[PDB]
Amino acid sequence: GIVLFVDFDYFYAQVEEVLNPSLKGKPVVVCVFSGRFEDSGAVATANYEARKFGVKAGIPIVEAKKILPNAVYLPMRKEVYQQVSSRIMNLLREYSEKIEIASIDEAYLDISDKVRDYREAYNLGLEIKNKILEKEKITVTVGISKNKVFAKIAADMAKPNGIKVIDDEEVKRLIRELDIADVPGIGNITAEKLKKLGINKLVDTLSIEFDKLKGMIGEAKAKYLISLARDEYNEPIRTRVRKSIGRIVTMKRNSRNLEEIKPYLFRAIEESYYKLDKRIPKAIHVVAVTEDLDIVSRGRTFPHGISKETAYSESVKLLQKILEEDERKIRRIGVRFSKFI
DNA sequence: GTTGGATGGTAGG
DNA sequence: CTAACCCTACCATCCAACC
Ligand SMILES: Nc1nc2c(ncn2[C@H]2C[C@H](O)[C@@H](COP(=O)(O)OP(=O)(O)OP(=O)(O)O)O2)c(=O)[nH]1
Ligand SMILES: [Ca+2]
Ligand SMILES: [Ca+2]
Ligand SMILES: [Ca+2]
């Protein structure tokens, strides 16, 4: 069982460099402008030239411009990166039909029936990389291991423009050596709970009574971690199926006024319904982000599919339901559809 | 004794 | 308006309905 994982390098920015070769070699920052004020919004991603100065996904644009005034700031174009992505995902399809698309820039190929061993996987990996570079002019990073988790880790070690195998040896070693916060799915809240406990390595999780582990991090992560340490984790590559689709936008200024908010919410339903694409949902949720950035939502599930007419009506009720139960003002508003037929 | 809906927490793209 | 966009997956909790 060999899994190969591909993750595109600084994707959004790379696509702009390809689309405009004069940018290449100098700082580039791809932004989501929010409309509230001059240069408001956040960074979606930056090239490595820019990361050298502290500019990464998530920081505010005005922060980016503080520390890197002279870089090139480009509005985000989602449609463009998604067509390049789809073209790339199709190239990958010619190397294994057994493909799991994980996000707009990464995919898992199960390559067992294509290669006899790690050495061949590596070669196939080099072949994938050239293919993509030839057809799309995009560099990527490749991770190869016996499962999804470790293929992901191997890639994280190799970025950017890399390729790395973690063979059955190294898997055994990393279950002992690797800091536990480097396990995909272990973020900041969970790492704290584990270090306060004295779990620093995947291996430590077999040295602790299951219920205390489960008591702290929850059942599912516990099973996840323990499964990973027994070297039994074997969750297969599966064709992903969107479970929800939605959209949320930022308002020019904070509001509580249903009339002032309404057109924002409706924009979101329109876009949302466009992306639905023949999918009928039974569940609608209105999501609202507040002044202090806390996220609040109100929903409903119908025994039956929701039409675009119903969505407009139910969402307005739900918005009011929010305004009713939370007295904070609203800063971003949107909607999320789920539970398809 | 377990669905599952409503809501929120966590993680990561 | 004075920083914090953006989209999705999975899980936990509290709560009800079933039976
Ligand atoms: N709007 C927004 N978009 C993001 C954010 N994080 C990632 N993206 C988008 C932009 C990235 O180019 C793309 C892929 O994200 P990645 O996590 O793989 O990092 P990226 O490819 O940009 O650099 P790479 O070498 O992986 O590290 O997804 C974010 O916080 N906000
Ligand atoms: Ca990437
Ligand atoms: Ca990625
Ligand atoms: Ca981590």
Side-chain angles (χ1 to χ4, degrees), chain A residues 172 175 202 205-206 224-233:
Chain A
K172 290 193 187 306
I175 286 167
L202 272 169
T205 65
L206 320 166
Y224 174 63
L225 300 188
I226 299 163
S227 154
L228 275 155
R230 305 211 123 100
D231 199 344
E232 301 184 331
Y233 181 104

Side-chain angles (χ1 to χ4, degrees), chain A residues 238-254:
Chain A
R238 41 183 65 209
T239 309
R240 287 200 204 183
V241 169
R242 259 92 149 81
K243 277 194 181 49
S244 64
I245 279 192
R247 162 97 229 214
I248 130 175
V249 307
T250 306
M251 305 197 303
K252 283 226 175 84
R253 47 229 178 97
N254 284 17

Side-chain angles (χ1 to χ4, degrees), chain A residues 180-188 191:
Chain A
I180 190 142
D182 290 21
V183 181
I186 299 305
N188 252 248

Side-chain angles (χ1 to χ4, degrees), chain A residues 52-88:
Chain A
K52 285 261 204 289
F53 295 90
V55 181
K56 35 129 167 295
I59 69 148
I61 294 150
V62 299
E63 247 170 62
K65 306 218 200 203
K66 208 203 276 75
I67 64 185
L68 259 187
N70 293 324
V72 176
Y73 290 89
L74 296 171
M76 174 176 74
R77 296 178 293 167
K78 193 90 188 272
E79 336 67 63
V80 182
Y81 322 136
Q82 178 58 83
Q83 288 156 10
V84 170
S85 190
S86 287
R87 287 201 312 280
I88 289 165

Side-chain angles (χ1 to χ4, degrees), chain A residues 5-8 11 103-106 152 159:
Chain A
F5 162 86
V6 179
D7 190 324
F8 319 142
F11 189 44
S103 70
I104 205 204
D105 93 321
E106 57 191 79
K152 178 108 156 186
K159 265 181 201 166

Side-chain angles (χ1 to χ4, degrees), chain A residues 109-157:
Chain A
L109 293 73
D110 178 349
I111 56 174
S112 305
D113 297 305
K114 310 280 176 167
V115 305
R116 195 168 311 204
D117 60 14
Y118 285 127
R119 167 191 64 89
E120 296 205 344
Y122 182 81
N123 288 344
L124 187 78
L126 283 178
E127 209 174 311
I128 286 160
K129 284 166 67 83
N130 306 341
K131 195 74 229 165
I132 295 170
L133 194 69
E134 280 179 0
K135 295 270 164 156
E136 289 303 339
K137 284 248 181 283
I138 287 301
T139 68
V140 314
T141 301
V142 174
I144 302 169
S145 212
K146 88 206 289 160
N147 63 35
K148 287 198 271 178
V149 179
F150 281 98
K152 178 108 156 186
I153 296 174
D156 290 351
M157 296 169 170

Side-chain angles (χ1 to χ4, degrees), chain A residues 244-300:
Chain A
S244 64
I245 279 192
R247 162 97 229 214
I248 130 175
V249 307
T250 306
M251 305 197 303
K252 283 226 175 84
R253 47 229 178 97
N254 284 17
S255 200
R256 277 190 62 73
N257 193 64
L258 189 92
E259 299 309 313
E260 180 168 8
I261 305 182
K262 252 160 65 211
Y264 288 105
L265 177 65
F266 293 158
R267 179 165 329 162
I269 300 178
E270 280 303 307
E271 265 147 63
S272 259
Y273 233 84
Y274 175 79
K275 296 200 216 149
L276 270 164
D277 187 10
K278 283 182 168 201
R279 279 181 286 237
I280 333 273
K282 295 139 159 170
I284 179 168
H285 284 262
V286 171
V287 181
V289 176
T290 62
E291 311 191 47
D292 42 59
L293 289 196
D294 199 25
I295 292 179
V296 166
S297 71
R298 284 314 183 275
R300 168 158 187 188

